[PDB]
């Protein structure tokens, strides 16, 4: 189990187990338990990445595995298959619907694949790839100027338009999560050096950093509540003060 995601509304949730096949749950508007919608085996290497698409087009899932492939899925049943990589893929995320329906992946190799799926028929599942180049890493998109953040081993880069435009300074070890503030915009990362950093981008970069090993970091849609989760064995949630230093509100333990 390396990932679990949410749809646009918050009803369904896709999960790629340890076991090559990927489940998808949903809870009843009647009683709150998490029910299974379907379960099927796509890639052979435990999946490590997952995302949902924007409903502006429909209902789709993109998987990413160590079988050097990324696949599109509709209702489920496979649509298209991406096998450009010569190296396993580690992360995947649909660009914000605001630009349209494009994609971006990253794997062992170092290929920043950006498959853009378009057509004036508007409905074709055909996808050509616009890729340019720079073990554990990942990546995150920006919603609004087409920009996305990227995490490599111990590095953190920010691309624009494939035209590098800013790097994130600091991480003294391998990064593990990258999240773009839903919006000046801000980004967060869960580094292995055992700390959470919040960088602030305008139009340049600053930092506001808070201190085991941090693993997964998340934002919500509003109140921009950040999520540090790590080997500590707990989850912490942060809000912004009147002056933008983030402070911890409350904590959840898994003792």
């Amino acid at each position: 189990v390396h990932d679990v995601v949410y749809d646009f509304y918050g009803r369904h949730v896709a999960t790629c187990s340890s076991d090559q096949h990927i489940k998808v749950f949903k809870l009843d508007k009647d009683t709150s338990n998490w029910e299974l919608s379907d379960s099927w085996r796509a890639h052979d290497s435990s999946i490590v990445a997952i995302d949902w698409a924007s409903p502006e087009y429909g209902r789709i899932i993109a998987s990413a595995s160590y079988d050097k492939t990324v696949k599109l899925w509709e209702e489920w049943n496979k649509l298209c298959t991406l096998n450009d990589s010569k190296g396993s893929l580690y992360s995947v995320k649909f660009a914000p619907a605001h630009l349209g329906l494009k994609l971006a992946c990253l794997g062992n190799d170092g290929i920043l694949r950006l498959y853009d799926a378009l057509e004036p028929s508007d409905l074709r599942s055909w996808t050509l790839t616009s890729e340019m180049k720079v073990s554990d890493f990942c990546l995150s998109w920006c919603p609004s100027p087409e920009k996305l953040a990227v995490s490599a081993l111990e590095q953190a880069i920010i691309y624009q338009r494939l035209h590098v435009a800013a790097k994130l300074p600091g991480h003294k070890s391998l990064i593990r999560s990258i999240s773009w503030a839903p919006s000046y915009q801000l980004i967060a990362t869960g580094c292995k050096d055992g700390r959470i950093r919040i960088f602030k981008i305008t139009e340049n970069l600053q930092v506001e950093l808070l201190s085991g090993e941090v693993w997964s970091v998340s934002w919500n849609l509003t109140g921009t509540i950040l999520s540090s989760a790590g080997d500590d064995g707990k989850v912490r949630l942060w809000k912004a003060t009147y002056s933008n230093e983030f402070k911890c509100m409350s904590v959840i333990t898994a003792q």
Binding site: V4, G10, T15, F25, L221, T222, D231, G233, Y242, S250
Partner: protein
């Protein structure tokens, strides 16, 4: 083991998948599960929507009634606990802010004072009977007279009155009595006119009713008991505010323990703002809404104003909460005109619409806010469900 935590929209659901294979759903701590809180919000928002407008004075102090009430009521709905404790606490802080800047005469003020004071979860009740003369009686006797609790005082005097009764009896005639200034005369006439170590404790008590600062600090056990005491027994003016509040604090420190005591000091000090960041910590909602009253009485998306900030950051709570009936509060609060537009434009997408009426509303927005990109697509889910219907009627 490596945890991981993904986010919202909540309404109680964030996921916490880890590592062995379990999926953990979890709520945002202290998050208000909609409840009768859904009703409280709207109730304030109506006070809010009613204020769009000397005349400002009176009308404001009235809206304070409204707000105060609306909270007293919600607090009941709850009793019938964490959420209760830290709610009540907001009340006392806020029960203060009225007594100090929302009454300006002589009758209503004292009430609110006494009110504000004793309603602050302070009950010697088990100890009234744990005292049933000696030292302990005397200390207590006065603490009651300080907190304005006069009927109580007398009741507890009924113990051992019998055996200079001529004065005791008289005092009760006076305590039963409260122009008031004429009162304080009668109180002193008696103090001056006036067998053992008990005979001494008695003169003290008379000085406390007379308002002997040095003594309203002797038998006072908490900075606010004195503060009040003074106001009630020494001389009632708010232009002596800052000095009543200073003497008291040198005498007996304040509790960092209860997150309510400090805030009210700041209220008495004039330093308001230092309230609102505490307020939020208790209930983001009422804080956003006390912030506003204050402001009434008295490209830049934040640091527009301090009150205009807890508003917009309270709205953004509701838009991740899910209550279909509270969005008209979010967007209501939210309405620079071109900026709002871009904010409304990314919020409306997440509206949990159902009824044709719900959609009748959502559109009602697009008209005045001109978000045509937002309706066009709606038209498509709406248009789609219609087709799904036709395709089922023909069958």
């Amino acid at each position: 083991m490596p945890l991981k935590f993904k986010l919202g929209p909540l309404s109680y659901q964030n996921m916490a998948f880890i590592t062995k294979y379990k999926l953990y759903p979890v709520r945002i701590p202290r998050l208000d599960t909609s409840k009768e809180f859904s009703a409280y919000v709207s109730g304030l928002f109506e006070i809010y929507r009613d204020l769009g407008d000397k005349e400002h004075n009176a009308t404001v102090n009235l809206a304070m009634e409204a707000i105060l009430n609306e909270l007293e009521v919600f607090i009941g709905r709850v009793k019938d606990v964490n959420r209760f404790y830290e709610l009540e606490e907001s009340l006392t802080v806020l029960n203060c802010l009225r007594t100090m800047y929302f009454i300006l005469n002589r009758s209503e003020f004292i009430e609110s004072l006494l009110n504000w004071i004793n309603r602050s979860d302070g009950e010697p009740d088990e100890e009234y009977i744990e005292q049933v003369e000696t030292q302990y009686f005397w200390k207590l006797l006065n603490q009651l007279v300080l907190r304005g609790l006069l009927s109580q005082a007398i009741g507890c005097i009924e113990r051992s009155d019998l055996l200079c009764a001529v004065s005791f009896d008289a005092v009760s005639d006076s305590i039963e009595l409260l122009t008031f200034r004429e009162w304080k005369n009668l109180v002193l006439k008696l103090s001056q006119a006036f067998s053992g170590e008990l005979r001494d404790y008695i003169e003290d008590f008379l000085l406390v009713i007379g308002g002997n600062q040095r003594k309203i600090l002797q038998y006072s056990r908490t900075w606010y008991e004195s503060f009040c005491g003074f106001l009630l027994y020494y001389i009632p003016s708010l232009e002596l505010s800052a000095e009543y509040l200073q003497m008291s604090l040198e005498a007996n420190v304040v509790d960092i323990t209860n997150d309510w005591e400090q805030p009210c000091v700041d209220i008495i000090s004039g330093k308001i703002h230092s309230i609102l960041p505490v307020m939020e910590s208790l209930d983001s909602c009422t804080a956003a809404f006390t912030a506003m009253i204050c402001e009434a009485k008295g490209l830049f998306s934040y640091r527009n104003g301090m009150a205009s900030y807890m508003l917009n950051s309270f709205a953004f709570e509701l838009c991740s909460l899910g209550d279909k009936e509270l969005w008209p509060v979010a967007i209501g609060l939210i309405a620079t005109r071109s900026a709002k537009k871009m904010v409304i434009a990314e919020l409306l997408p997440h509206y949990p619409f159902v009824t044709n009426d719900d959609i009748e509303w959502m559109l009602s927005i697009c008209v005045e806010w001109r978000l045509p990109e937002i309706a066009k697509e709606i038209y498509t889910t709406l248009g789609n469900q219609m087709l799904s219907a036709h395709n089922i009627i023909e069958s």
